[PDB]
């Protein structure tokens, strides 16, 4: 069923599996129009597919020109998502397909069970966990390709760069989702924080800064310490 | 006006006859049910004081042979037998009418119940789901499973009702998944109408029986099929303005029928709300809404 702290270590064992995140396919900034009314004017989302395993990232771009004259966007957004996922998964060769799916929305699972009838071994599951996918775009490169297109397109990272050489998937994990957090709960310190050392660069072929362990040791401290500050500042503790 | 005859009434029962129910005690001298409706099915069904588990009954229409009623002592229920000489059926029937030992089938002459919650169930129909062909009546209980059940274990003793399955490659078209989940007018209209039932009259026989087999023996394979029949419609944006029409009055009737003691079982909140407030169709089954309103206002 659904994914939680009792089976964490599911997600890094050798049954290929998917996180799917929906929340920034349909975005839109809102805006007062001459008449002083409220409209929308879509922009580029983002579909977040990722293996925790490996690293992985299949990036699928939305390009505003697919809300075109389309109805009901928040919904139509689910279903694109899934149509996507499903697409995804067909274009991959057997033995790279998943096992399971996990939806980090309960909303994405009708529409993805029904977009994957064809595919009936693959589980499709719910999370109980509360991840930080939203905060993608806040990885500036991530964030670049989005916004840069012109059509439709698939992109593919690894979102670990090479810490699995050094690391384990369980804490290759961990430290995204302790940087996603972070970069969620305040951007700019989690962004400064990252990068207010420039003797530490970003390699072109890389998203995050290349910090050797003990960096890696300090930059994860300070990254708790933000939490628990915001965390302080919101709720005056 | 039509008999069904009992050999006797060995042990103690509470004895139904479609929507009538009467107590028979132990070794009472009881012969069966007379001036039964010719026109309609009916259900003969049968419920022992010394153990209201297995509530277990008979589907028959009087048209289609002469039936009666025995206890079987070895497998401990009251059986349907029919008695294929004609004469001697009618001998006893009569002696037995002589003799002033059968109940009245009680029908009140303003009364259209009954038909309104049979139009339309035929027996052969009933014989497409009850599977025992070598009986012209079929036989119910509260335990027996479905089709559809069975896939999620006797074959034999199974309701073979039309399985219904919103999320099932058969519901939903390929390249039209969130067309055809959100508006299911096209499983409803070109798979179920036009592929399976051929015209609405079926499509409403079987709802028909799903309900009153879940009214009747409890059997909790026939609510799901018969709340499965309704949400088709209500979650279809296109249906025929005359399939609404009669919807409204079948679910009237049902509703009307339905003992209040057991809505709370009977009865699925999510569906009916869906159906009556958020659907397609939650403006065109005004008797329906009117009667669940004022009868059941604590479900919704
Ligand atoms: C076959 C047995 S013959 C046993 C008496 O000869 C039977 O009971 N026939 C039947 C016909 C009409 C009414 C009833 Cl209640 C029964
Ligand atoms: C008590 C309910 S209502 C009474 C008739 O409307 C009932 O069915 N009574 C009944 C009694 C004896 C025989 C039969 Cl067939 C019916
Ligand atoms: C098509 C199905 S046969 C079952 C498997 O699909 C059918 O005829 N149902 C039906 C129609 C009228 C009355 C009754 Cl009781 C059932």
């Not at chain 1, 924080?193 to 660069?201: H, K, V």
């Not at chain 2, 005859?5 to 005690?25: C, H, L, M, R, W």
């Not at chain 2, 009140?108 to 789901?129: A, C, G, H, P, S």
């Not at chain 2, 944006?237 to 009237?252: C, F, G, N």
Request: hydrophobic share 40%; proline share 4%.
């Amino acid at each position: 069923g659904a994914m939680n702290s009792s089976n964490y270590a599911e997600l890094f064992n050798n049954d290929i599996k998917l996180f799917v995140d929906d929340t920034n396919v349909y975005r839109v900034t809102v805006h007062k129009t001459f008449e002083g009314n409220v409209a929308t004017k879509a922009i580029n989302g983002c579909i977040f597919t990722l293996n925790p395993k490996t690293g992985h990232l299949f990036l699928k771009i939305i390009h505003t020109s697919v809300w075109a004259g389309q109805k009901r966007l928040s919904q139509l957004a689910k279903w694109k998502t899934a149509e996507e996922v499903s697409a995804l998964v067909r274009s991959l060769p057997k033995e790279e397909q998943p096992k399971q799916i996990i939806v980090t929305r309960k909303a994405m699972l009708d529409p993805l069970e029904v977009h994957m009838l064809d595919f009936p071994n693959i589980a499709i599951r719910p999370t109980e966990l509360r991840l930080p996918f939203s905060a993608a775009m806040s990885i500036d490169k991530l964030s670049d390709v989005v916004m840069k297109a012109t059509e439709p397109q698939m992109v593919l990272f690894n979102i670990y760069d090479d810490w699995l050489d050094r690391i384990s998937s369980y804490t290759a994990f961990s430290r995204l989702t302790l940087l996603l957090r972070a970069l969620k709960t305040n951007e700019e310190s989690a962004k400064m924080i990252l990068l207010s050392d420039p003797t530490i660069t970003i390699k072109s072929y890389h998203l995050w800064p290349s910090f050797t362990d003990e960096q890696w040791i300090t930059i994860e401290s300070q990254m708790r310490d933000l939490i628990l500050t915001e965390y302080g500042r919101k709720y005056n503790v | 006006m039509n008999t069904v005859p009992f050999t006797s009434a060995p042990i103690e029962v509470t004895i139904g006859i479609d929507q009538y129910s009467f107590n028979v005690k132990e070794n009472q001298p009881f012969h069966g049910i007379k001036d039964i409706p010719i026109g309609h099915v009916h259900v003969i069904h049968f419920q022992h004081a010394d153990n209201s588990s297995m509530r277990y009954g008979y589907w028959f229409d009087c048209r289609m042979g002469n039936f009666y009623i025995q206890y079987d002592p070895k497998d401990g229920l009251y059986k349907m037998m029919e008695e294929r000489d004609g004469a001697k059926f009618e001998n006893i029937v009569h002696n037995f009418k002589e003799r002033q030992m059968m109940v009245s089938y009680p029908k009140i002459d303003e009364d259209d119940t009954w038909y309104n919650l049979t139009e339309f169930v035929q027996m052969d129909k009933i014989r497409k789901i009850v599977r025992k062909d070598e009986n012209q009546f079929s036989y119910v209980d509260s335990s027996m499973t479905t089709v559809q059940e069975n896939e999620l274990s006797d074959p034999a003793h199974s309701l073979n009702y039309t399985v219904i399955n919103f999320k099932s490659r058969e519901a939903i078209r390929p390249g039209h998944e969130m067309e055809d989940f959100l508006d299911k007018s096209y499983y409803l209209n070109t798979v179920m109408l036009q592929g399976i039932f051929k015209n609405s009259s079926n499509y409403f026989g079987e709802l028909q029986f799903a309900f009153l087999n879940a009214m009747f023996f409890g059997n909790y394979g026939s609510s799901l099929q018969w709340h499965a029949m309704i949400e088709l419609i209500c979650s279809s944006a296109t249906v025929p303005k005359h399939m609404l029409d009669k919807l409204d009055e079948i679910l009237y009737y049902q509703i009307k029928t339905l003992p209040e003691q057991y809505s709370d079982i009977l009865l699925n909140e999510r569906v009916w709300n869906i159906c009556l407030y958020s659907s397609f169709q939650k403006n065109s089954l005004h008797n329906t809404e009117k009667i669940m309103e004022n009868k059941y206002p604590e479900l919704l």
